[PDB]
C-alpha cells in the first residue's frame, strides 16, 4: 500500500478520476493508490506514475503526445499503462511542470523519450514528435543514473558523473559555450572533473541546475529574474558555481517556472528567481536574485520538495506537507483559491504520513509508504 492524494487543476482529468475542475483539498486517488507507486511526476496538465513493478501509467491531456500512449489529441481520464515500456523495469520518469515531453530511465540504465519533439529535446537527431517512447540510441553505451527534462531541453547523467544535455540551445541552457540547438545528447565538457549527481531543467527561457557529489551547485542558461542565483539578470552558456550554496549540503535541486529551489541535508529550503504570484515563499512577490532561505520553514526538517509552475510543496520528516504560491486552481490545498504567500500547512492529510510530493503545472500530489 502507497496512498496517493491529488489536488489542483483537473480540467483535462490530469488528477486521474475526480469530478470537478478545481480540487481545492487533497483527495484520495483510488486509481493511483491501487498501483503501488514509487514515483508520481507532473507535467503540463499531465500526470505520470511509476510502480514498484516498474510499469508507467499516465493520465491527463494527450496533445503533442505528452503521455506516450500512441495518441495525440484528446484526454486520458483514467491512468493508463504506457505499454510500449511493458518489457522494461522503469525506475523514474522525468518531466517538467510546464513540459510536453518526458523521458524514462530503466533500472538497467536505458533512457526512452516521447512527446513533443521541438528543438530536438527527445534526442533522436530530429525535431520529430514521438507519440510512443523511443530509446535514445545516443546513450545506449552509457549507464545513465538520473534524468531531467525542461520545457525545451533534456538532461541525463551517468554513474561516472558526466552530464549530457540536448534540446533548444537558445539563451545557453545546454551549457556547451554557445547557443546552438543540439538534436543529440552532448556532454558538458566544462563539468568534467566534477561528479554530477543531480540536474534540473527549467521552462520557457530556461535555466539549468547541476549538483556535484561535493555539494557544489552550478547554474547556467537564461538569467531573467535572477534564477541563476548570482545576482542581476545576465544569462550564460557555461556552468557557473552558485557560490552562496557552497558548504550548505544541498541534496536536491528543482526548477519551476522561472525560479529555482534547493533543499539541504539538514532540511532547509532555498529559493530564488521570479517572484510573481509568490512562488518563492518569502511572503512577498519581489524577485530574489541570489538564493535565500525560506524562513517560513525554519525549524522544520524538510525531507522532500517539489515545484510546479507557480507553486511548491515540501514534506517534513513527520509527514506534514507545506505549500506556497499561486492558487488559481486550488493547487495550494487550502480549500480556497487564495494564494499562500508563505509556506502553509496543507489541509486534509492529518494521519497520513506523507513521504513524497510531486507537482505538475497547476496540480499537486502527495503519497505515503
Amino acid at each position: 500500500r502507497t496512498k496517493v492524494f491529488v489536488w489542483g487543476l483537473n480540467d483535462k482529468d490530469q488528477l486521474g478520476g475526480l469530478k470537478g475542475s478545481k480540487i481545492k483539498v487533497p483527495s484520495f486517488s483510488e486509481t493511483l493508490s491501487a498501483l503501488n507507486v514509487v514515483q508520481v511526476a507532473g507535467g503540463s496538465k499531465s500526470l505520470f506514475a511509476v510502480t514498484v513493478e516498474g510499469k508507467v501509467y499516465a493520465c491527463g491531456e494527450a496533445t503533442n503526445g505528452r503521455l506516450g500512449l500512441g495518441i495525440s489529441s484528446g484526454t486520458v481520464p483514467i491512468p493508463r499503462q504506457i505499454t510500449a515500456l511493458s518489457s522494461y523495469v522503469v525506475k523514474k520518469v522525468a518531466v517538467h511542470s510546464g513540459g510536453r515531453h518526458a523521458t524514462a530511465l530503466t533500472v538497467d540504465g536505458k533512457v526512452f523519450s516521447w512527446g513533443e519533439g521541438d528543438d530536438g529535446k527527445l534526442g533522436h537527431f530530429s525535431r520529430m514528435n514521438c507519440d510512443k517512447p523511443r530509446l535514445i540510441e545516443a546513450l545506449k553505451t552509457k549507464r545513465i543514473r538520473d534524468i531531467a527534462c525542461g520545457s525545451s531541453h533534456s538532461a541525463a547523467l551517468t554513474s561516472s558523473g558526466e552530464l549530457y544535455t540536448w534540446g533548444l540551445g537558445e539563451y545557453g541552457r545546454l551549457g556547451h559555450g554557445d547557443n546552438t540547438t543540439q538534436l543529440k545528447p552532448k556532454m558538458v565538457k566544462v563539468l568534467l572533473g566534477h561528479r554530477v549527481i543531480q540536474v534540473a531543467c527549467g521552462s520557457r527561457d530556461a535555466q539549468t541546475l547541476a549538483l556535484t557529489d561535493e555539494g557544489l551547485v552550478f547554474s547556467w542558461g537564461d538569467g531573467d529574474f535572477g534564477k541563476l542565483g548570482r545576482g542581476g539578470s545576465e544569462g550564460c552558456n557555461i556552468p557557473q558555481n552558485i557560490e552562496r550554496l557552497n558548504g550548505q549540503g544541498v541534496c536536491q535541486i528543482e526548477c519551476g517556472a522561472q525560479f529555482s529551489l534547493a533543499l539541504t541535508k539538514s532540511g532547509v529550503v532555498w529559493t530564488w528567481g521570479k517572484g510573481d504570484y509568490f512562488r518563492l515563499g518569502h511572503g512577498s512577490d519581489v524577485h530574489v536574485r541570489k538564493p535565500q532561505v525560506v524562513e517560513g520553514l525554519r525549524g522544520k526538517k524538510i525531507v522532500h520538495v517539489a515545484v510546479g509552475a507557480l507553486h511548491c510543496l515540501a514534506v517534513t520528516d513527520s509527514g506534514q506537507v507545506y505549500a506556497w504560491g499561486d492558487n488559481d486552481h486550488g493547487q495550494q490545498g487550502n480549500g480556497t483559491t487564495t494564494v499562500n504567500r508563505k509556506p502553509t500547512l496543507v489541509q486534509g492529510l492529518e494521519g497520513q504520513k506523507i513521504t513524497r510530493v510531486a507537482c505538475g503545472s497547476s496540480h499537486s500530489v502527495a503519497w505515503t509508504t
Binding site: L9, D11, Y277, S361
Partner: peptide, 9 residues
C-alpha cells in the same frame, strides 16, 4: 502569466 494554466472547464 505565460506560465499560468487556463481552466478549460
Amino acid at each position: 502569466d505565460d506560465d499560468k494554466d487556463e481552466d478549460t472547464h
